[PDB]
Nucleic acid binder design. Structure first.
Length: 638
DNA sequence: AAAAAAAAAAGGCGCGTATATAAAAGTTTCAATGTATCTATAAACCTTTGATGTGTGTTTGTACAT
């Protein structure tokens, strides 16, 4: 509602029917011919020079970049919406498609492309010279201010004001769209629904949140601080929040943890206003304050963070703020002095708000921040946008769709993010558990899946292989119930939820730079803390449907957060896939976007040498049939 | 009734009472010095007991097959 779904929907514009091709225009003109109606991308015989052409292709659709002449392409509806930042000559892309009119030129698609170039940069929501107003700016969304009632009748005929930009400032459209068809000064009351009304009245309107163009502020408790540096993937995001008129903001999809505070530093530094920051959990947040927050540009003293047990200095500093949603994303609240903090900052006209990895966060709890801050601008930072909660209003119509993707196979040609060759070992199955798996019921069937004799024979082989060629391991699995049994039946450490803080320390200290106790297991809450800077030998064993997304996201921090820049980087991933079992199809459906990312995958049902393992307990299958007798228990508890 | 041994008894040897003369040899007594031997005593440990952050725990809000 306030936000819009439009941030997780790539792979579109595929305009082609049972008779798509028109009289091949590019048939004669063969310098370049992408799939037009689709928006697909394909080179032409009068034109093979590719590498420099990365950017032009970046404007449209999805490639196949292990393609030879070129990679693939596609149309994208909101994709043109993103392109407005440059906002170049619209027909030029069509003019570029002029040669690329491969079939008879799909003017309809071209119009669709002209349409594909309709919204972004054609935004419409008024603003005024140190205030906000009820007008509109570009053709794509112009009326998204003027004809309105929360933007038009919620646009107030006030003439013009920077100093007069405050009383109203039908709430602060300080982040209004492109502005000023006759712009009626914006008010102070009711856009918390406008953001909902927007797509409700479906205005593809390009929000704009300025750098100094709202003098409801003698611009407030920030200031520019640029000390930072840049790896090859920054600047676009930074200038991505400028546009036309006055500045703006948006949403960006990233493998996070890359000093994303630093990019957060800039835009906040570049508005000098009131801003707050948010992260998941005192479980999660502390990987932020002090190894990647001070090599940067901020003074050492200001901010406060709040848990009323992990509390700070509140009622104290005029400067900026930082908190957690789930803290107040709920009627959860520890010390009523929280409501000594709650009321203002909630009610406070924050210039900007920072939300981070809201991906897992549900509307059923995510709407609180929507109902909490309503800051004049917002930060969009999560893991993945194609989702399971693909529901109606994603945070876009609040902030925007994804602004910057990542880049993996050919920009990382500046910085190698950990060359991957994924492995899935296709271990067959025995009916012995499986027979009563044919007798099972609700997901307590899946426990039987965990009862596979094959995992063991391979499990050590993985440990053996890794150390037979001598590189240490990081493993992935689930369902601790017996997976914990696996651990100290693997000769390897056990890790489990519902665990005291004390014991968490003994895991790493005489363990990291040592070279002997070189194996690890993972829980379902421990993954919410950290992964080692070591052992990119990545082995999946056990997972679970739906979690697949975050499970796949869970795999992310290992490699992408790594940045070392060697020649090859012979790194690999591995996984356990017990054959003839309920999940692998869903795992293939999980695999369905594995090499989507270009980070590839190779399969081995059996390698050269899996059986080389003589230390496996249950070497003969009667212990595996002893296992059957233990296999009963929990599934006889079940 | 007669023989033998000890006491009853005194007077005097011979130097204590002074007593100073002086030398000659030696003693003992007094006080500073040295040392193992009591003790308290406060500074060592060990255990106790009252105050204490907090690991685990009752409500909130959750992807997720079911």
């Amino acid at each position: 509602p306030a936000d819009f779904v439009p941030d997780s929907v790539s792979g579109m514009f595929r305009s082609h029917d049972f008779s798509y091709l028109r009289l091949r225009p590019d048939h004669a003109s063969r310098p370049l011919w992408i799939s037009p109606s689709d928006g697909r991308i394909i080179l032409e015989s009068f034109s093979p020079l590719a590498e420099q052409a990365q950017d032009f292709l970046v404007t449209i659709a999805e490639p196949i970049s292990r393609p030879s002449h070129i990679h693939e392409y596609k149309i994208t509806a909101y994709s043109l919406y993103a392109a407005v930042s440059v906002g170049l000559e619209t027909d030029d892309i069509i003019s570029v498609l002029d040669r690329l009119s491969k079939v008879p030129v799909a003017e309809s698609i071209i119009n669709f492309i002209k349409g594909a170039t309709i919204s972004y940069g054609k935004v419409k929501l008024v603003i005024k010279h140190n205030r906000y107003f009820v007008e509109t700016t570009q053709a794509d969304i112009l009326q998204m201010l003027l004809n309105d009632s929360v933007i038009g009748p919620l646009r107030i005929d006030s003439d013009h004001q920077v100093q007069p930009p405050e009383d109203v400032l039908e709430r602060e459209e300080e982040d209004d769209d492109i502005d000023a068809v006759h712009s009626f000064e914006i008010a102070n009351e009711s856009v918390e629904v406008v953001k909902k009304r927007c797509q409700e009245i479906d205005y593809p309107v390009l929000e704009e949140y300025d750098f100094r163009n709202d003098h409801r502020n003698p611009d407030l408790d920030i200031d520019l601080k640029p000390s930072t540096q840049i790896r090859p993937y920054q600047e676009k995001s930074l200038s991505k929040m400028f546009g036309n008129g006055r500045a703006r903001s948006g949403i960006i999809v990233l493998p996070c943890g890359a000093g994303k505070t630093l990019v957060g530093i800039t835009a906040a530094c570049t508005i000098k206003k009131s801003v707050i920051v948010l992260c998941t959990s005192s479980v999660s947040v502390m990987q932020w304050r002090q190894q990647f927050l001070q090599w940067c540009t901020l003074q050492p003293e200001n901010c406060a963070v709040f848990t009323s047990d992990n509390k700070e200095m509140f009622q104290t500093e005029s400067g900026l703020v930082v908190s957690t949603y789930s803290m107040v994303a709920n009627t959860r609240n520890r010390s009523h002095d929280s409501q000594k903090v709650m009321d203002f900052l909630t009610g406070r006209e924050w210039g900007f708000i920072i939300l981070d990895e809201v991906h897992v966060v549900p509307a059923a709890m995510f709407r609180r921040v929507v109902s909490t801050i309503a800051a004049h601008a917002k930060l969009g930072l999560t893991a993945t946008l194609v989702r399971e909660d693909d529901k109606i209003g994603d945070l876009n119509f609040l902030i925007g769709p994804k602004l910057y993707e990542a880049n993996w196979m050919e920009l990382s040609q500046k910085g190698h993010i950990a060359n991957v060759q994924c492995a899935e070992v296709w271990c067959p199955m025995t009916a012995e558990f499986y027979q009563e798996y044919l007798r099972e019921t609700a997901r307590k069937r899946m426990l039987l899946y965990i009862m596979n004799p094959t995992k063991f024979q391979a499990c050590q082989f993985l440990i053996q292989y890794h150390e037979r060629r001598g590189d240490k391991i990081i493993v992935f699995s689930d369902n601790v119930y017996a997976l914990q049994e696996y651990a100290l039946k693997m000769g390897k450490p056990f890790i489990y939820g519902s665990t005291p803080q004390q014991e968490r320390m003994n895991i790493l200290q005489n363990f990291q730079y040592n070279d002997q106790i070189n194996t690890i297991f993972l829980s379902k809450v421990g993954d919410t803390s950290i992964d080692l800077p070591e052992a990119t030998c990545l082995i999946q064993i056990s997972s679970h449907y739906g979690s697949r997304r975050q499970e796949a996201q869970r795999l992310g921090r290992i490699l992408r957060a790594k940045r070392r820049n060697d020649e090859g980087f012979n790194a690999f991933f591995y996984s356990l896939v017990s054959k003839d079992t309920q999940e692998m199809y869903y795992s293939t459906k999980r695999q369905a976007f594995l090499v989507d990312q270009g980070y590839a995958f190779k399969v081995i049902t059996h390698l050269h040498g899996m059986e080389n393992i003589p230390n496996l307990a249950y070497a003969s299958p009667r212990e595996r049939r002893e296992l059957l007798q233990e296999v009963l228990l929990k599934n006889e508890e079940a």
